[PDB]
DNA sequence: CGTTTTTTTTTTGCATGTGCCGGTCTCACACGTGCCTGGAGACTAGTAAGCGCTTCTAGTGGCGGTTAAAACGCGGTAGACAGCG
DNA sequence: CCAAAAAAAAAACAGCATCCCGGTGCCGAGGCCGCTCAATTGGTCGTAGACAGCTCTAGCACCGCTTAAACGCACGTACGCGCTG
């Protein structure tokens, strides 16, 4: 059927101070402006590519709920394997 | 009034956050962003709370690794300021970027 | 005598006799085309396997092949493949 | 009741008390150390599978588990991993 | 001792297919140490397949698996 | 008294060599460097000339590929002359070395 | 103001590469045989999974408040970047 | 010598934030229990792979001749590199 919620544009929810903290951990001392919407470009392509794969896993398993474990079979498939969520 | 030099608090922030391991994206915006994207493939999907944490661990790390790769390309063009041209580069060698 | 080494060469000659049927092929290219078949073979059968194995299944069906072809092949390459596979299967069962 | 989730974490507690007695662990960490063994299992077992398949053999012996553990691990972990693996095999074959 | 056999004019030609115009002389040195490291990695593993078949002749199919191991798949020899 | 300008022949050699597909390392000096290193893992070894060929293909191809990235890292440094620090960087990012 | 300039267009002559006419040669694609093993077929056998029913986990959504993080602006330090030798 | 002066430096004072402390609180580590199922024991049966034998492919050795390629040196141009605004 259908219910409350249809989409939105949370892309701008990546506060500048959020991307800045990633880069501060990534050893970065100085950050251009053009940076923060550049990162919004990549981070968006990342998840699209993981979640495509994770959604492909859920659809095989004929669920409607994406698990932690669906994300992991994809993340590994995309050579970025994660320890701390089973598998 | 007191005033540190540009760069000074940038150093302390590095040391402060390199030390810790806690997520630096706000888990709510992220979730909405994960949901928003999830819809594009198929709408009305439920997500385990571990699944949105699974992605938010995967993404935040990948990017911290990208900013390491990126900060070198910048120093490698003799600069300190990272730039678009550095993330483009990093990704290109990496082969994430045709 | 010799070994008895199975290739795909006769099948690649017919798919060549079906697309650019004038142009032939060097033996160095035929070993490449051969190596190509066996790679995606090994990739799909490999992903199809792990799907079944994550979903507690003791059988790989049409459906696990498909779901490999989705993950593996990007955008428009997947699409045409899924359809050629779907058509191939539907056209098989319905034939006899 | 809840149905079963088989994990390696009882062995990891023992092996923890072996190596550092009075050192503990967190749930998450134990979840990590879980993942670790699975990955490795899948790696090692995986290369070994190929070794059988490549040499026209049906059964994986510890010789395949060795030829594998060399290829996959780095020099000084491989040496030691090959050690402990020969030790456990000679002690079982004698003790039995 | 045989390392050099990979001549300075040979490296030049690789880089020219690599889309290089001007090359530091420091690079010819560098390239050897890289190339050596690549063949070590690939050879080592490729023999590891030979010594497990128990042959003493290394085969095309031994290199193909060792490159495929290292991420480097090689279409053309067996496969 | 004719001479070409430092670069305009390199570009002719580039143009030419990409267009072609023959092995740009001499076949014997390689076949020895195959044997030489191979004796360090086990002595008394043979090689199918095809499996020599296999290594030349993959090693030439590898370096071709690496020069492209090293070229890209040196352009990125406001240069056309590639350097060792441009190989060092393109491997570091490639995740071949640390 | 009309003098030295660089130096920016203009033939100017020049050298390779790309053929498009020739022409000759060789070995690898191409195709033909002969036989052998790997897929076809029909029957049997057992259980994987497809289906319907139930359990009850856990995923959603909404509140209301506290105050931590997002935002925005100002100011000037310092780093990017161009120029030039 | 005794100036610059400006630049370059040293430290002296003053200020800000992080580190490590005990004082406090709770929840997740860690363990114990009781039970189910998956690992073990024992026995049987079928074949995987080891072994010996033989065939013969192809990998190694060497050789002498014909260049194609490597080497080597020379001259100067264009590009790496520093310094500065």
UniProtKB/Swiss-Prot annotation, chains B, F:
Modified residues (Phosphotyrosine): 4
Positions of post-translational N6-succinyllysine modification: 19, 42, 85
GO biological process: chromatin organization; epigenetic regulation of gene expression; gene expression; nucleosome assembly; telomere organization
In-chain residues carrying the UniProt-annotated modification Phosphothreonine: 43, 70
Modified residue annotations for N6,N6-dimethyllysine: 42
Illness the protein is tied to: Glioma: Gliomas are benign or malignant central nervous system neoplasms derived from glial cells. They comprise astrocytomas and glioblastoma multiforme that are derived from astrocytes, oligodendrogliomas derived from oligodendrocytes and ependymomas derived from ependymocytes.
Name this polypeptide is given: Histone H3.1
Species whose genome carries this gene: Homo sapiens
Gene: H3C1
Full-sequence portion shown in this chain: 39 to 136 of 136
Curated annotation (Swiss-Prot), chains C, D:
Protein name: Histone H2B type 1-J
Function: Core component of nucleosome. Nucleosomes wrap and compact DNA into chromatin, limiting DNA accessibility to the cellular machineries which require DNA as a template. Histones thereby play a central role in transcription regulation, DNA repair, DNA replication and chromosomal stability. DNA accessibility is regulated via a complex set of post-translational modifications of histones, also called histone code, and nucleosome remodeling.
Residues with PTM N6-(beta-hydroxybutyryl)lysine: 5, 56, 87, 91
PTM annotation: Monoubiquitination at Lys-5 (H2BK34Ub) by the MSL1/MSL2 dimer is required for histone H3 'Lys-4' (H3K4me) and 'Lys-79' (H3K79me) methylation and transcription activation at specific gene loci, such as HOXA9 and MEIS1 loci. Similarly, monoubiquitination at Lys-91 (H2BK120Ub) by the RNF20/40 complex gives a specific tag for epigenetic transcriptional activation and is also prerequisite for histone H3 'Lys-4' and 'Lys-79' methylation. It also functions cooperatively with the FACT dimer to stimulate elongation by RNA polymerase II.
GO cellular component term, pick one: nucleoplasm
Positions of post-translational N6-lactoyllysine modification: 14, 56, 79, 87, 91
Gene: H2BC11
Residues where N6-methyllysine is found: 17, 79
Domain of life the protein comes from: Eukaryota
Positions of post-translational N6,N6,N6-trimethyllysine modification: 56
Native organism: Homo sapiens (Human)
Covered residues, full protein: 31 to 126 of 126
Chief localisation class: nucleus
N6-crotonyllysine found at: 5
Post-translational modification Phosphothreonine, affected residues: 86
Residues modified to N6-(2-hydroxyisobutyryl)lysine: 5, 14, 17, 28, 56, 79, 87, 91
Curated annotation (Swiss-Prot), chain E:
GO cellular component, one term: protein-containing complex
Domain of life the protein comes from: Eukaryota
GO MF annotation: an example: structural constituent of chromatin
Result, substituting residue 9 to L: In TEBIVANED1
Mutagenesis / variant outcome for changing residue 8 to R: Abolished ufmylation
Phosphoserine modification, residue list: 24
Residues the record lists as Phosphotyrosine modifications: 28, 65
Cross-link Glycyl lysine isopeptide (Lys-Gly) (interchain with G-Cter in ubiquitin) residue location(s): 68
Phenotypic consequence of residue 9 to R: In TEBIVANED3; results in early developmental defects when expressed in zebrafish embryos
Modified residues (N6-(2-hydroxyisobutyryl)lysine): 8, 21, 36, 54, 56, 68
Protein's cellular compartments: Nucleus; Chromosome
Cross-link (Glycyl lysine isopeptide (Lys-Gly) (interchain with G-Cter in UFM1)), chain numbering: 8
Keywords noted in UniProt: Acetylation, Chromosomal rearrangement, Chromosome, Citrullination, Disease variant, DNA-binding, Hydroxylation, Intellectual disability, Isopeptide bond, Methylation, Nucleosome core, Nucleus, Phosphoprotein, Ubl conjugation
Effect of mutating residue 68 to Q: In TEBIVANED1; results in severe early developmental defects when expressed in zebrafish embryos; results in defective cell cycle progression when expressed in zebrafish embryos
PTM sites of type N6-glutaryllysine: 8, 36, 54, 56, 68
Family affiliation: Belongs to the histone H4 family.
Role noted for this protein: Core component of nucleosome. Nucleosomes wrap and compact DNA into chromatin, limiting DNA accessibility to the cellular machineries which require DNA as a template. Histones thereby play a central role in transcription regulation, DNA repair, DNA replication and chromosomal stability. DNA accessibility is regulated via a complex set of post-translational modifications of histones, also called histone code, and nucleosome remodeling.
Subunit structure: The nucleosome is a histone octamer containing two molecules each of H2A, H2B, H3 and H4 assembled in one H3-H4 heterotetramer and two H2A-H2B heterodimers. The octamer wraps approximately 147 bp of DNA. Found in a co-chaperone complex with DNJC9, MCM2 and histone H3.3-H4 dimers. Within the complex, interacts with DNJC9 (via C-terminus); the interaction is direct. Interacts with NASP; NASP is a histone chaperone that stabilizes and maintains a soluble pool of Histone H3-H4 dimers.
Name this protein carries in UniProt: Histone H4
UniProt source species: Homo sapiens
Shown part of the complete sequence: 25 to 103 of 103
